[PDB]
């Protein structure tokens, strides 16, 4: 079910996974037209919509250095750790929200980005170069 923009903010992570392209399509282009030339009030909103794409491309950069690169669901080769969220499957995706998930991972989330940028493409790419000549 759609329910529009951010409609599944309190639903399950499996049901909210069914609304990924809706939250994405409305974050980048909230296009305001600035054809009128008004001096000092443009530099505040233009700085805002320039920092918007600076924050956007920072996520695309993190979504580029990882083996994941399609702007969709994507799988990696880094194993899940039992210390992170000591829970089984379907306890998460059918009784948890993305907010409460990010809250429990916020303690351990900072190292996961490093485990996705070094443990893979510093070695996966190196293995791809050392396994394609044959």
């Amino acid at each position: 079910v759609f329910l529009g923009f951010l409609g599944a903010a309190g639903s399950t992570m499996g049901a909210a996974s069914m609304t990924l392209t809706v939250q994405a399509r409305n974050l980048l282009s909230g296009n305001p037209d600035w054809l009128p030339d008004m001096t000092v009030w443009g530099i505040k909103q233009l700085q805002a919509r320039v920092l918007a794409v600076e924050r956007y491309l920072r996520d695309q950069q993190l979504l580029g250095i990882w083996g994941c690169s399609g702007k969709l669901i994507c799988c990696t080769n880094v194993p899940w750790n039992s210390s992170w969220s000591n829970r089984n499957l379907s306890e998460i995706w059918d009784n948890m929200t993305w907010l409460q998930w990010d809250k429990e991972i916020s303690n351990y989330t900072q190292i996961i980005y490093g485990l996705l940028e070094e443990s893979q493409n510093q070695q996966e790419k190196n293995e791809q170069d050392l396994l394609a000549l044959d």
Binding site: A9, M13, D33, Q45, A52, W80, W101
Partner: protein, 453 residues
């Protein structure tokens, strides 16, 4: 068995503060007043306001730590200065003014204070100078010692005249969220201001807000939902103000009865100063009418909402203002171009029994008028209001109050809620209490079973 998987586009937000937009409201091209408040730069409104309710969502709001109020406060001030920047300056008006009381002091028990001032003003040319007259009005020096006068506006700051082509009629301005961010809108009827909102929706552009500069009485504001709200940053602490929102709008009618006229006397090569001409017709003081039955009912409805914090079956009082600044002690606002400074002492004489209080079709309020305002937090400038040619009458809804509690050991005795104000940010919190700005963080990680290569 299970591996980490990224998900791009998850509904995850973290509260932050960033620059917001502003809306044109779409009738701006058909206004053609050359410049309204923010018609200058704001972009038109979307054809359909994307208001989406978020089920199962409880979000913690706090209107008193909000950064949207600081933005609109800094937008209004920068709106004042940029509006008065290219207009006509009146620094040569700081001269000596030999003035005279108005010719009609009839029954000096009643008051009459307009000063038929004449002075040597500079002219079109620089060689000669001409003598003009008729600045008028109560705000003035007493002189140093026909009696001489000068401007005490000159005793503080420089003076510039407001452009006569622009207007002060507030255009509905609703702030808008930029790309990548969202605005969360509380929706339950009763809301403390501080606490979790169980029914939250999201929008980009907010609902239409009229930038209204008013003290002691909130004007043309948004009505509450079903019950009168008593919001405060800290109710126990006396110094913190008590914002009130009304359920039923209190009708108010203000009039400047003096069928007035203007004079465009020429000063300098391009400038032109507008002076208050001789009053045509009879004269009497400006006033504001509030129906006594509606105000009696509104007070009888607010007193019950105030007893929920201060005691069931107890008495509360509220007298007039204490004293101090003219903009603080008086219900100051604008209408048509003139700046009414009415005294609300005729509204706040009340003590309350647990069932009643301790005809007269209406309650009238005396009101003085002022044209030179030092309301600007930059004390380096002051604005001269151009005279309005004709009679002025404007109606409005009264939606709010700003009250201060008398401190001390008044527990066993009664409490007193004198009116107050001063800080412009309190005029905005009654409209931005239900709004919070959040930034979107769509990068999420979650374990599922899958394998690459």
């Amino acid at each position: 068995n299970l591996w980490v998987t990224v998900y791009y586009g998850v509904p995850v937000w973290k509260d932050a503060e960033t620059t917001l937009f502003c809306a044109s409201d779409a009738k701006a091209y058909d206004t053609e007043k050359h410049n309204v408040w923010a018609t200058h730069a704001c972009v038109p409104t979307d054809p359909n306001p994307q208001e989406i309710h978020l089920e199962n969502v409880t979000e913690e709001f706090n209107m008193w730590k909000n950064n949207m109020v600081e933005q609109m406060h800094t937008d209004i001030i920068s709106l004042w200065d940029q509006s008065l920047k290219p207009c006509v300056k009146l620094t040569p008006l700081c001269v000596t003014l030999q003035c005279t009381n108005v010719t009609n002091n009839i029954t000096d028990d009643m008051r009459g204070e307009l000063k038929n001032c004449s002075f040597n003003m500079t002219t079109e040319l620089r060689d000669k100078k001409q003598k003009v007259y008729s600045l008028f009005y109560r705000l003035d020096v007493v002189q140093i010692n026909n009696k001489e006068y000068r401007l005490i506006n000159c005793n503080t700051s420089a003076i510039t005249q407001a452009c006569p082509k622009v207007s002060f009629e507030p255009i509905p301005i609703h702030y808008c969220a930029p790309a990548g961010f969202a605005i969360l809108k509380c929706k339950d009827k009763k809301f403390n201001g501080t606490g979790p909102c169980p029914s939250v929706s999201t929008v980009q552009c907010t609902h239409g807000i009229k930038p209204v500069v008013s003290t002691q009485l909130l004007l043309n504001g948004s009505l509450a939902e079903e019950e009168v709200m008593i919001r405060s940053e800290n109710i126990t602490n006396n110094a913190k103000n008590i914002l009130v929102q009304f359920n039923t709008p209190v009708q108010i009618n203000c009039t400047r009865p003096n069928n007035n006229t203007r004079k465009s006397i020429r000063i300098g090569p391009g400038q032109a100063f507008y002076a208050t001409g001789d009053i045509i017709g009879d004269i009497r003081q400006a006033h504001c009418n509030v129906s006594k039955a509606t105000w009696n009912e509104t007070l009888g409805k607010v007193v019950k909402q105030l007893r929920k914090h201060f005691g069931n079956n107890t008495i509360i009082r509220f007298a007039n203002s204490s004293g101090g600044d003219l903009e603080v002690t008086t219900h100051s606002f604008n209408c048509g171009g003139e700046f009414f400074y009415c005294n609300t002492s005729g509204l706040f004489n009340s003590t309350w029994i647990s069932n009643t209080s301790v005809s007269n079709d209406s309650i009238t309020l005396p009101c003085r008028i002022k044209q030179i305002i030092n309301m600007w937090q930059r004390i380096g400038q002051a604005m001269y209001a151009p005279p309005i040619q004709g009679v002025i009458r404007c109606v409005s809804n009264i939606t709010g109050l700003i009250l201060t509690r008398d401190g001390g050991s008044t527990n066993s005795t009664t409490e007193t809620f004198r009116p107050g104000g001063g800080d412009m940010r309190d005029n905005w919190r009654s409209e931005l209490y239900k709004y919070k700005v959040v930034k979107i963080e769509p990068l999420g990680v979650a374990p599922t079973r899958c394998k690459r290569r």
